[PDB]
Amino acid sequence: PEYVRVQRQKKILSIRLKVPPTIAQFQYTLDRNTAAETFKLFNKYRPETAAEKKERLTKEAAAVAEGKSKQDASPKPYAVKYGLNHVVALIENKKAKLVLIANDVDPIELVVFLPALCKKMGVPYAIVKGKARLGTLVNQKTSAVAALTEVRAEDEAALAKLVSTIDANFADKYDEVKKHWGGGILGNKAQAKMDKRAKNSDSA
Amino acid sequence: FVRAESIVAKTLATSREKERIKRVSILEDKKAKNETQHIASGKDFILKITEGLIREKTTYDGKPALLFIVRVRGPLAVNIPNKAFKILSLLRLVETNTGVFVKLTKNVYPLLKVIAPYVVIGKPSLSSIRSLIQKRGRIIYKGENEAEPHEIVLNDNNIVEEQLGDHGIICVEDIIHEIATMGESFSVCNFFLQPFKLNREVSGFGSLNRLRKIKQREAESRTRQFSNAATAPVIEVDIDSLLAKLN
Amino acid sequence: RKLTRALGRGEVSSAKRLEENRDSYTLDHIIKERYPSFPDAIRDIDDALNMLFLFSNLPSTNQVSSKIINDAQKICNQWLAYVAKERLVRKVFVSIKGVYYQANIKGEEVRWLVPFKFPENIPSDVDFRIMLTFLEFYSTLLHFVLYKLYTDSGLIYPPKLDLKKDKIISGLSSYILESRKYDSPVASLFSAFVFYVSREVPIDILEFLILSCGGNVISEAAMDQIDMSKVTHQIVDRPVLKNKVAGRTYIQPQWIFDCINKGELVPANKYLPGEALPPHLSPW
Amino acid sequence: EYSGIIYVSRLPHGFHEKELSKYFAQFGDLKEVRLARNKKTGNSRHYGFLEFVNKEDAMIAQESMNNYLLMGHLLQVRVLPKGAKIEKLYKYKKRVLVEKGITKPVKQLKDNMKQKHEERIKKLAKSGIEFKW
Amino acid sequence: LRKLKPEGNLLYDTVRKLQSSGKVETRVPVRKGRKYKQKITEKWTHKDFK
Amino acid sequence: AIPRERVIKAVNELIKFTSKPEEELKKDLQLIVVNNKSFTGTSKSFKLKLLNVKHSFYKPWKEASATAVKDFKVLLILKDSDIKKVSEDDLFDQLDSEGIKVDEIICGKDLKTVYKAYEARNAFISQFSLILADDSIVTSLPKLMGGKAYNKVETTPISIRTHANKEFSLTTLTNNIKKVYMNQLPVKLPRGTTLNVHLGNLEWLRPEEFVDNVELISEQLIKAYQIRSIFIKTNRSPVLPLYYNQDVLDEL
RNA sequence: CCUUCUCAAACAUUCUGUUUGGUAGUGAGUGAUACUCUUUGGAGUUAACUUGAAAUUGCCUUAAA
């Protein structure tokens, strides 16, 4: 179907055409082990579901109806930040401790500057594959980003360890992303043709 | 692929289970030697879970009592130690969800303490025993054309007289009476019963069946305990409910 | 598909909320459209009781989940308690395939078979799913039928049961009936009698008949967990019975079957062990 | 030309030599494997060494595990230079205690204590301490 | 009567009755069916790995 | 009984040795070394003996720590389900009359979740100089807090009977913590002949109080373990052979 | 990629008193004062302080696919 061939030719064009370095920094995604560890850590701080939010609302209403210290009886909240504009606002403040970035945002321009702004402000960041995986913990179809402005003291050591692991696995391993433009892969038939030509030109 | 993290967690859980087995065997040897001056506790203990859940504790007192061990999966990371594997092979509790009756005794009580995490324990009702015998009865064969090495279902009452009749045992109702009464030569009936293979609590892997399995694992975590203290009382779940669920 | 999405998203609480917000389809409208003239619904009852008594006896296995077996055993115990309280039994026929039964239902005849309570192999060659659907349809039909039969008699439904009685023998004594002459002769047979039974004889198939006839019943199996001060008879089938009390009558189990098939109360001197019984003298 | 010998560190507890052999064997055959341990205790020192029969397999396994977080430890590995002659790294076990006495006659140690009391008194007097008796 | 040994299977009798009534079709149980090999291929995410 | 005049002369000599002039805080510590043929049966044992004392030795300790950077504090631990019942006010209202106060109460579940990450485990345990714990939880502590806490007597948990009658009679725990603070000097019993009790800083107690405490400790030790010999010393000071019993050697 | 021993007895009724038992730790490093023995072969202990669970080489499977 024409949409299938259209998307396939679009992927083939994205693979064949040369890419500026600011693009193609995506697909240098965090390794599946560190990514699974980051998701196991983020899962503890998923945003509250609407049913739990209504339960907390009824609890605070019952407390105000008889108790004191209105809206203060509840514990401090602890949930991953996920709003794109809210995430960018957390940077350059700077309360953010980490900033995940989906590699597969449909508008590539929306997130191309996020790694550069994070490198400018120094906030740790990584490009996890798949916006849907970031959205599953967010209780939303897609979020394209995730961050942790605060964390429980018991998890602070695991958070620092995950930050150092992400740095060693990405910030140093992919320092060459500034250069070496991607997208240079040739087609299979053209590759075989050039190989046979180079072989015949100087070999039997 | 071994997936190093898995083998590491397995080695750690196995080392913990081995340390617990050593701590239990030390107390067992100290009790067999009657060197009670240093034992952490001077008496056996047992506990009964009941429906946040209600709980109670009572000394075993050494009185014999019927029990129906039921093999259960887990702990997930613990490969079976050879000692626990031998203690289970003595009870013929292979093929998890297998069950077998046992005559509790002071000599047998410590053995349950080592396999306690591996198997739930309780006191089935006599109706539960009648259901377990009438639903999944099976019998070993010998001599007797079409061939001896073949298990046969427990239907013909006459075979119970042809085999167990030297003891005076009669049709399966007599075996049920000998089991509920804990009468003489009850162990021969246990060997002759071909311990029942209870069906797994639910077939599934569907979404609704996955939710059912999640609720079952949650209830199991709420019920089962792994204190590994070597002195915690053995759990005594209401086996009648587990049998009504599995049967 | 919604539950699969809730399970794949990791929000198990949403899956529980979705499972709570649903209800199983009811067949009662099909039971009404398919069987007008409720006695016409009784005309087809024979298949329902047969399929239910069959499914109740088989061991729990995959594709059963045992909940269907429990509902079948419950409906069977309820139908048996109703047949006993109303003394509707009229004929019996033991068979190698099971103990056949017959009883009037507002004057309609209703034959049914009771499988023996023994383990049975599953060939697995049959299409079990169609049997399960037929069992569900027959269960809804027999449930509506028992509800109408209980409302007609004024008995509370579903009948209450003492849980302690279920833990002993789980027999017909469970689900005691109560309100919110007798058929003469088949009803109130063996009146004022208090039978006893040896362990070797079946307790369920025999106690239900003596109870439908109104005679009292006691079993040695009840003594395994726990008076015999009023027993007037003691069924026994052992090859060599232990020394009997001189004042108590003794008879083989078969004597009840011919007495129900005839109702003449044939002399006790017949069917005395070890003497051979008449082959069957079957009603049919 | 890096040797097939490999160094490892920050191993989580329970990552004994059997585990390092079972895991690294999937990458290929290894001529030897060992793990450091305290001489006075069986606990691991959280570092060890390994040797692959094929030098390329050593660097290939090192490329993947160089930053493989595991049990909260940021595992690290660095291929050793040429040779390096993997060393003793004895597989120490928890040494049992063993008594070696008393063997001398009690009168001798009693006289030795009676002499050592006056010796310590003279020694503390040598330090200027005024303690007596 | 205690000597009685049950014979046959009631499930086969109920199936034969349902077939004699005509309410249900009867046939040999079906097995897994596939007229083609269902060719598998490596994912591009793995095929590009070096 | 050991002569009291000899202990008086020994404490006076220790006061002279410490009067010679943060190294002084290390040099001011007092101890009573003691020897035995085989302590604890040769088997390791972290259990501490609660030696009797005629005075509240901990009170001067806290009174000196209040002016010191050491910031003396008393940790408390209870059954994991019991933390919900033990509000801090329930201890505050009862202990303010005596002037003692517990800096914090900690559930045993907290040790496995928030006080892991050994750096934090040492940063938290270091703040307290007198740990306390329930009789049941104390056996699980070494697996949780680790063995570093047991290296120092200040960090080792002390048993407390929260459940004299089962199911959380608070008055038992209250009187138990009171007696543990005012009339007890816990000390470990390690492997080998060597042993010593931590008498605390020499400056705190009056010399007669130190003499009476050393006398009661030597009496209890002779009654219990048949100590082969006894000594007392300032941290840097050579051991003083104030007393010894040759008769114990005959059983060697 | 698991998670740790979270109570047992005796006199005693004291609105909890008393006594007994039960407790093997991440490793490395810096370092002061000493004890026991043991036969110089040196093993067991004894104030003190640093740390990213840091580190260069001491002769049973329906928790599947």
Distance CA D97, CA F192 (A): 12
Strand G neighbours among F 98-157, CB < 7 A = 108-109, 112, 116-120, 122-123, 126, 134-144, 146-148, 150-154, 157
Structure tokens at F164: 């004299």
Q: Which residue is nearest to nucleotide G22 (CA to C1')?
A: B40
D70 to chain A: which residues are within 8 Å by CB?
33
The subunits that touch chain F, with at least 3 C-beta pairs less than 8 Å apart, are: A, D
Distance CA B98, CA B70 (A): 6
Q: Which residue is nearest to nucleotide G36 (CA to C1')?
A: F193
- The answer to whether A142 and A117 have CB atoms below 8 angstroms apart is no
- The answer to whether D28 and D57 have CB atoms below 8 angstroms apart is yes
Distance between the two ends of chain A, CA-based, in angstroms?
Answer: 44
Burial label, C101 (beta-carbon count in 10 A; 0-12, 13-18, 19+): buried
Number of helical H runs and strand E runs in chain E: 2, 0
Chain A contact present for F114, CB below 8 A: yes
Q: State which H helix or E strand residue C69 sits in.
A: helix C67-86
Chain B contact present for D31, CB below 8 A: no
Closest CA to A144 of A133, A160, A157, A155: A133
B230: phi then psi, degrees, rounded to nearest 5 = 65, 0
* Length F188 CA → G45 C1' (Å): 13
Chain F contact present for D98, CB below 8 A: no
* β-strands B138-139, B152-153 pairing: antiparallel
Radius of gyration of chain A (CA): 23
Structure tokens at C268: 């006790």
Q: Which residues of D31-57 are buried (b: 16+ CB within 10 A; e: fewer)?
A: eebbbbbeeeeeebebebbbbbeebeb
- The answer to whether C115 and C244 have CB atoms below 8 angstroms apart is no
Q: Determine the 3-state secondary structure of B119 from DSSP.
A: strand
The subunits that touch chain A, with at least 3 C-beta pairs less than 8 Å apart, are: C, D, F
Strand G neighbours among C 60-99, CB < 7 A = 62
Chain B contact present for D15, CB below 8 A: yes
* β-strands F159-160, F133-134 pairing: parallel
Starting from the edge strand earliest in sequence, which strands make up the sheet with D76-79, in order?
D30-37, D44-52, D5-9, D76-79
Q: Determine the 3-state secondary structure of F133 from DSSP.
A: strand
Q: Do A137 and C10 touch (CB under 8 A)?
A: yes
Q: What is the DSSP letter of F81?
A: T
Report the amino acid identity of residue C81. A
F250 to chain D: which residues are within 8 Å by CB?
106, 110
- The answer to whether A84 and A110 have CB atoms below 8 angstroms apart is yes
Distance CA B102, CA B94 (A): 15
Q: State which H helix or E strand residue B24 sits in.
A: helix B4-32
Q: Do D70 and B5 touch (CB under 8 A)?
A: yes
Q: Determine the 3-state secondary structure of C137 from DSSP.
A: helix
| Stated resolution in angstroms | 3.1
Chain B contact present for C59, CB below 8 A: yes
Distance CA A50, CA C2 (A): 17
- The answer to whether D131 and F240 have CB atoms below 8 angstroms apart is yes
Q: What is the DSSP letter of D10?
A: -
Q: Do D74 and A165 touch (CB under 8 A)?
A: yes
Q: Determine the 3-state secondary structure of B89 from DSSP.
A: helix
- Contact between the CB of B232 and strand G at under 7 Å: yes
- Closest nt to B4 (CA→C1')? G1
* Length C153 CA → G11 C1' (Å): 69
* Length F82 CA → G5 C1' (Å): 17
B120: Cα within 13 Å, side-chain hemisphere = 24
- Dihedral of CA atoms A37, A39, A40, A41 in degrees, nearest 10, equals 90
Distance CA D84, CA D92 (A): 22
Chain E contact present for C99, CB below 8 A: no
Chain G bases closer than 7 A to any CB of the protein: 1-9, 14-18, 21-28, 32-39, 41, 43-65
Distance CA C174, CA C157 (A): 14
Structure tokens at D82: 């040429």
Distance CA C157, CA C153 (A): 10
Q: How many CB atoms lie within 10 A of CB E6?
A: 18
Distance CA C209, CA C261 (A): 11
Instruction: Work out how many CB contacts closer than 8 A connect A with F.
Output: 10
Distance CA B105, CA B67 (A): 10
Distance CA D64, CA D76 (A): 10
Q: State which H helix or E strand residue A194 sits in.
A: helix A188-202
Distance CA C236, CA C273 (A): 8
Ordered domains of chain A (ranges, CATH): 1-187 (3.30.1330.30)
A79: Cα within 13 Å, side-chain hemisphere = 13
Cis-peptide, bond into residue F142, ω within 30° of zero: no
Q: State which H helix or E strand residue F181 sits in.
A: helix F170-182
Distance CA B209, CA B219 (A): 15
- CA D131 to chain centroid, in Å, comes to 45
* Length C259 CA → G59 C1' (Å): 96
Distance CA D76, CA D60 (A): 14
Distance CA F161, CA C174 (A): 51
Helix extents (H) in C87-170: 128-153, 163-166
What residue has token string 């996890």? A128
Chain C contact present for A149, CB below 8 A: no
- The answer to whether A15 and E44 have CB atoms below 8 angstroms apart is no
**Total residues belonging to chain D:** 133
Distance CA F72, CA F69 (A): 9
Q: Determine the 3-state secondary structure of D50 from DSSP.
A: strand
* Length C61 CA → G27 C1' (Å): 54
Report the amino acid identity of residue F94. Q
- The answer to whether C19 and C86 have CB atoms below 8 angstroms apart is no
Distance CA A25, CA A182 (A): 9
What residue has token string 């006993």? C84
3-state helix, strand, coil in chain F (%, to 5): 40, 20, 40
B246 to chain C: which residues are within 8 Å by CB?
60, 66
Q: Determine the 3-state secondary structure of B210 from DSSP.
A: helix
- CA C153 to chain centroid, in Å, comes to 19
- The answer to whether C141 and C31 have CB atoms below 8 angstroms apart is yes
What residue has token string 């004024």? C154
Q: Return the beta strands (E) in chain A as ranges.
A: 99-101, 125-126, 145-147
Q: Do A153 and F116 touch (CB under 8 A)?
A: no
Structure tokens at A139: 């209780």
Tell me the sheet residues that pair with A100. Answer: A126, A146
**Total residues belonging to chain F:** 252
Scan residues 34-73 of D and list those with Cβ closer than 8 Å to B. 70-71
Distance CA C102, CA C112 (A): 6
State the smallest CA–CA distance between residue A54 and chain C in angstroms: 14
Distance CA A10, CA A15 (A): 9
Q: What is the DSSP letter of B147?
A: -
Strand G neighbours among A 124-183, CB < 7 A = 157, 160-161, 163-164
* Length B84 CA → G57 C1' (Å): 39
Query: What are the contacts of F219-223 at 24+ separation with CB within 8 A?
Result: F219/F1, F220/F51, F220/F52, F221/F34
- The answer to whether F129 and F198 have CB atoms below 8 angstroms apart is no
Q: What is the DSSP letter of F39?
A: G
Distance CA A114, CA A128 (A): 13
Q: Return the beta strands (E) in A45-189 as ranges.
A: 99-101, 125-126, 145-147
Chain A contact present for D23, CB below 8 A: no
Starting from the edge strand earliest in sequence, which strands make up the sheet with C216-219, in order?
C216-219, C194-197, C233-235, C249-251
Distance CA C251, CA C196 (A): 10
Q: State which H helix or E strand residue F78 sits in.
A: strand F75-78
B60: Cα within 13 Å, side-chain hemisphere = 27
B157 to chain E: which residues are within 8 Å by CB?
2-5
Number of helical H runs and strand E runs in chain D: 3, 6
DSSP string, C213-249: TT-EEEEGGGGGT---SS--EEE---SSPPPPPTTSE
Q: What is the DSSP letter of A29?
A: P
Q: Determine the 3-state secondary structure of A132 from DSSP.
A: helix
The subunits that touch chain E, with at least 3 C-beta pairs less than 8 Å apart, are: B, C
Q: Which residues of B touch D (CB under 8 A)?
A: 1-2, 4-5, 7-8, 11-12, 15
